[PDB]
């Protein structure tokens, strides 16, 4: 946003299988105030908001 930057790099690797899934989803949040703009640059692995 105009005020913040969150840069996340996914980590490929096996974790203990919880209910037969060795992968994980990391959840993040960002707040956008009036007048600001959200910008998502992604080259992969993005679970997009609706």
């Amino acid at each position: 946003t105009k005020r913040s930057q969150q840069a996340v790099i996914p980590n490929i690797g096996s974790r203990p299988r919880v209910r037969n899934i060795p992968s994980r989803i990391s959840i993040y949040w960002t707040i956008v105030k009036p007048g600001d703009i959200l910008l998502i640059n992604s080259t992969g692995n993005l679970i997009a908001p609706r």
Partner: antibody
Amino acid sequence: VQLVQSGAEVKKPGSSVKVSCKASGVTFTYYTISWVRQAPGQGLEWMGGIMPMFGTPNYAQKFQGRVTITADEPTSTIYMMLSSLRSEDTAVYYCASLGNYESGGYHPYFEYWGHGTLVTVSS
Amino acid sequence: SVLTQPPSVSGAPGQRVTISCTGSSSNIGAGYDVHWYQQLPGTAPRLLIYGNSNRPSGVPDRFSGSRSGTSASLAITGLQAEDEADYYCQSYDNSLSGSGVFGGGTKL
């Protein structure tokens, strides 16, 4: 990984085909099981495909409506149902697992093959 | 069926170089690769090339290939009389699904 297809002797009048292809010991979860036919006297023809952990099996649009692939949690079976069999579905049906490689113009290839059920339609 | 394939002839020579050439228009020339599946008579086919140049675990230096522009070609550099089998080429298509276009396959 080793793919175990078997059975499917005859289904003459209408829709009866069902094939299993129980995959054994596949490690990476987001794998695939893509069904391929080979009529006696002709080359291959992609006919289905599924990712058991992902959703919405994928077809070839020359079979959309007359095929259906499913899966199972406890057993790793890949069940495929054909509807309205005709004389144009006498062939050998394979089940293969796709493998990867990192390059431009990526395209997944058929790493491991099963053995092939002998579906046959006759009077 | 979609890819043009050398219909039924590889012109089985002696131990010289033998080449099978497959080509098709855009949706195959839009940047997608080809592979090469040899099919021993009856038994399920075995992979030989992926990405037009690589060789999987357990294939000798007799087989090679290359996609040059809007066409691709297998190249059996060496040859021997115990390698007589079909050869199938896979590619991709953009007729909105078009995944496993194979062709007809050469022979011997």
